[PDB]
Amino acid sequence: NEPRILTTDREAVAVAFSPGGSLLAGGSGDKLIHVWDVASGDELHTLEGHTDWVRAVAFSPDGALLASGSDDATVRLWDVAAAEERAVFEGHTHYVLDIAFSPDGSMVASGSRDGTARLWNVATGTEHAVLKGHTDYVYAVAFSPDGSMVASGSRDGTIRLWDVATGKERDVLQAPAENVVSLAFSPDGSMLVHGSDSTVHLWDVASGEALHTFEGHTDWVRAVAFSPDGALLASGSDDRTIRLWDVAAQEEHTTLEGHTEPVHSVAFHPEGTTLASASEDGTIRIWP
Amino acid sequence: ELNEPRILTTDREAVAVAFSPGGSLLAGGSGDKLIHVWDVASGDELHTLEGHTDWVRAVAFSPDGALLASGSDDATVRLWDVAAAEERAVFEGHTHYVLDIAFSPDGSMVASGSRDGTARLWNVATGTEHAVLKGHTDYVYAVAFSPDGSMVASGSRDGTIRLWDVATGKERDVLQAPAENVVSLAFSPDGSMLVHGSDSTVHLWDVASGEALHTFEGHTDWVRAVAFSPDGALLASGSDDRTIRLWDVAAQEEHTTLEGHTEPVHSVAFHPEGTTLASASEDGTIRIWP
Amino acid sequence: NEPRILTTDREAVAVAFSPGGSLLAGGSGDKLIHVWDVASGDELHTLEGHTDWVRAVAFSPDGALLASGSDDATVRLWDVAAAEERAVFEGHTHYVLDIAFSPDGSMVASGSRDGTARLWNVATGTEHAVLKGHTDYVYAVAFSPDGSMVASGSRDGTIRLWDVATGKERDVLQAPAENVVSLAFSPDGSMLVHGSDSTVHLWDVASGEALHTFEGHTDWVRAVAFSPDGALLASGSDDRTIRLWDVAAQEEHTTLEGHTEPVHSVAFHPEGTTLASASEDGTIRIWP
Amino acid sequence: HELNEPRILTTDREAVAVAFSPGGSLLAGGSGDKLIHVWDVASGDELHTLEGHTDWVRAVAFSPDGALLASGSDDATVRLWDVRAVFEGHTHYVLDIAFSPDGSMVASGSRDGTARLWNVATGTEHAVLKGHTDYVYAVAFSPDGSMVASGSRDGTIRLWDVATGKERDVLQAPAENVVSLAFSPDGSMLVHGSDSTVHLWDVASGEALHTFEGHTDWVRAVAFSPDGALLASGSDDRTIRLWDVAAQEEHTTLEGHTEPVHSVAFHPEGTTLASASEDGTIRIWP
Amino acid sequence: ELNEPRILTTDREAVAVAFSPGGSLLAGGSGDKLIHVWDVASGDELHTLEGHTDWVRAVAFSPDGALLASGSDDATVRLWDVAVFEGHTHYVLDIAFSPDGSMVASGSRDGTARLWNVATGTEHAVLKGHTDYVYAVAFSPDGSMVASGSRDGTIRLWDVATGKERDVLQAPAENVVSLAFSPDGSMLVHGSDSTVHLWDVASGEALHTFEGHTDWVRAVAFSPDGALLASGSDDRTIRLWDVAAQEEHTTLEGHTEPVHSVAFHPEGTTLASASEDGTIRIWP
């Protein structure tokens, strides 16, 4: 079926649902974060303060805060209700390309072009750790659902796993011949998925071995997201499509067409009924 | 960030640095027998304090910013009027090189660490003689008051850090673990932790319990200076490996490596606002970074 | 409540209370600074040495020193008890129109018609920084209560925020239809007020956003001051009045009438029960 | 009569300069709102508003042909308006402008303590008048064009030989700032308006003819009658006073009250007077 | 037992001194980073050798008198014509030419004694076994053995031909700071933070411990005849002892200063002391 559309003046490169499902946050190239009421499709208050493109957004698990990463090299925290900048994190030397909120709510992770992943302490507003190892841009970061581990995806063709507590690297998953552009954990923590150029890979987390490769995209896969029950996987690509795959059977489920430009971010509704995609065509689409 | 805003050029060994309490001035101790005071904003050289006969190994501002103290290989500690309008006293009594000095938070006393194995607590306002603390058969390289002024810590060649109660001159605890000479020490603003710089390593201690909390590894040669950030988040180290490092206290991670220097880094110091740190090196430069 | 009145032989353009509350300094067109014992109403000393109008005055936080700015292009430091000139600062090329003493007591700020804001190190007597950003005259300077920041108000329609230590500009607030003629921080440090033509504007410091505009004045607002508890705002204007505003309610509190000429400066007693104004009518008035 | 005729409005700030056109039919108002207004003396029309200045306009003057107007502003420019302006500059704020009777020259009084003299056609600065130790608040050419007179905050009235840039006389007597100046149509006398009170000076002898007392506050404005018989004073006391130039006695007092009178100008036939006041009113009286 | 001249120019601690083999020239290594050479007969300043970047802790002449070696904190050993360089990973604190003149031994802060062939410039022998900085080295007069003093509190004897440790002399409570080999090769001297010890080479036992100094003993030198031993201390005395007896022979008062280094004239007529002030002194 056909989605709904929301419109931004500029490229929408990041999207996320509030934990309750009632709000939708959109990160854009107008240097703002837009917040929509999902039911009415009305645009609530905007979040301004970033000085460059907003590349990623994520809600706190309690839904009270929103974290954002930007090309201005900063990570900001926003009070959702008040639509206010609550904090600003500095340290990254280059564009911040991804962020993730810990399931705990106490930490934000960021990935940047400076070749590091950083962890920020939400309560104190300080840097908890800098994660060093990658030799190229870090395009994606994601927390393990138990909150103990963070995974980082880099252009150096590696996926690195670190202990959140100590900042220590635990594993390196090799993905050769490729730039890892996106990462996501399954909600059960058993699987990890990464987006590459035209391809989506599945990994068994306990083993660090590759389970399967999903073929069908014809361009860079910049966004991946697991459904809340882990059964479905969504991918966003430069080929303009969004693809759904059946995780257990490891086949194509369906292809979502409609975007006229690259899809930079994909996010499931917490109930699993809806998917949101953001595209360079300046639209956010909600698909059931 | 770790980027550097400015560079100062001195042309000799810059072995000690400290910021004024307001943040606007910088004192530099040099291999010349001189102390320099710089304006941080303009980078202008305000004044040069002469009198020492040998290397100046440590410098400190009084908490009220009116006085500078300097410790030297000539075996003296000198007190300078910052305005420069007035010469001041000199502290004599140490039999060997003085490698460290620290002001008590009230500005009434100064502590000094010498190679003679003694830590001396001198009176600033008063002209009387001072208390002697004895270091354990080995030279004392480093000294620091706790922020509350109740504790003084000393770093020695015995590979231990010593804590005294300032009021009674009583030795409260002994911190052991370093495999070598402890060259620097710094209290957390909380007063809860202590930071140790030694031969290759940076240690974190729980002051109350006298236990080691962590060891920071990453320097490849002797760590000559340490500094605790005002927020307590970060730690700064200077080393003979020619780098300076910033460490995340919680995780013990290399928040940043500052790679401008070509020669050993003898001293590091945080700005009072915690935004920038200054590093001093044998390459005859002072580098300021955020 | 009718105030009490002191006189100067010429225009009184500046006033400030000692931190203890017992003294009142008045800057005038006599080229002198007058000091009054508030309780007795007696004139304790005359500070002489300026060569032109004295435009602004400020006490050191310990009350031992007074700073003054003048049309002679100089900033002077006075020993109050001794009534002696202690230092003279030179460097500004044009009239100095405002001065401020930091809470730290280590730095004096000045704003001049030469388009620059200067910071002077009181202990050493040196020029610490020249702040250059503005493209027109600087009419006001104020320190943040934490002493980390200094703000400058200019004819170029900008308010600028600088780091005191490094002299680096941090922010530029835009107020474009307006010449910024006066500034004050709230004692909290959370808000800033600026005075323009007919209006007093309130800013949120952290967000740099405009909170309110206080309307009622019918001419230039040359002086603004927060009450020590932050609850009240005072404005001095060319319309000859002083207005008090309730900060939280954003409403008019009262209008102080009596002055027969423009009110150039206002200052609160540290207890908050009394206010002093200075006027071109050659009077300083103390109002409860 | 002293009847108040049209009250002229639209300026939104202090009106600090007024002048009649030489032909009598137009009225120019300079204000603190940074503009110059031109009015039809008959009321029937509103004419133009001259915009460009960035700061207070303190003086206006018409060229003797009535085709050009000059203005002085705090923005430090002297602008000649075609009635786009042409511009002239001052190191400091410019407070007074006067055209020579000839119309060949514009004199500008400034905060830099000097009077500038420009050749209108060329635009070339010809002479700088140096001598005052403070702001120059008012300037006027003698009817023969050979002399300029100036009032300053230094409390003096000065006479200059224009061609030679040379100071010829310094008239002293005011205790305070001289705020306005006027030259007599016969050129024999000069009028001072000050922070104390109005004075008359003999041009040839460089002596005081008289002191006019009556005002109870600052005198900001003075203007001679076209026949030279009378003098008008404007004050902070809110009266306009008329004095006999010969006898030196007060003739009449006009109570145009509630407002300080900042500028006054007589009509060319002498029947009318214009006053400027605060807050942007221009008043016309016979 | 007097003393004649005092020698000047060094701006810092003079921590090494050596006479040329044949007469006549004197070398001073200092904290000011340079090596001074002095003409002994005239008491003049012949030359200053510059290049080192850090403190110079040892100097030694080649047996032909044509080359001088220096050890510095800059981690170089340099050979000077009377320059060539060698490296160490750490600070070099001491050097000694073999009596043959074919080898330079260098003791470093890397816990090893380094041995180079001078003519080829190639390092061949590394002596390992010390657990801390090596502060002093000296060849046996036959060149078959090297002795080393370390901060580990030991004196070691090594067989030169095979980089193997032959003996470990223990006893000193603290850092050994200097060592010397007697001309007959029978006795070895240790200078430490408290005392000076004599080690019997054939027996591998301690002949005796010298207890007169009241502070650290920084230097030891054997007389050319082997009869007498000089000790230099922080207490500002130089002490002469009978090697056989081990009894104190004399005390030289310098006083104001701590003696950092001592050396005998090759004829045995003169003794040179180096001090912190940046003075060199000769006594008979």
Author numbering:
A (entry chain E), C (entry chain B): 451 to 738
B (entry chain C): 449 to 738
D (entry chain A): 448 to 530, 536 to 738
E (entry chain D): 449 to 530, 537 to 738
What text appears in the publication on this structure?
The tPkwA was the first prokaryotic WD40 protein isolated from the Thermomonospora curvata, which is a thermophilic actinomycete isolated from composted stable manure. In this work, we expressed and purified the WD40 domain of tPkwA (referred as tPkwA-C), and performed a systematic study on its stability, thermodynamics and folding kinetics. Structural analysis and biophysical characterization reveal tPkwA-C is a typical WD40 protein with extraordinary thermodynamic properties.
Each molecule of tPkwA-C in the ASU folds into a seven-bladed β propeller with amino acid residues 449–738. More specific structural features contributing to stability are further revealed by crystal structure of tPkwA-C. The hydrophobic cores in the lower part of tPkwA-C surrounding the Phe 467 and Trp 485 seemed to be major factors stabilizing the structure.
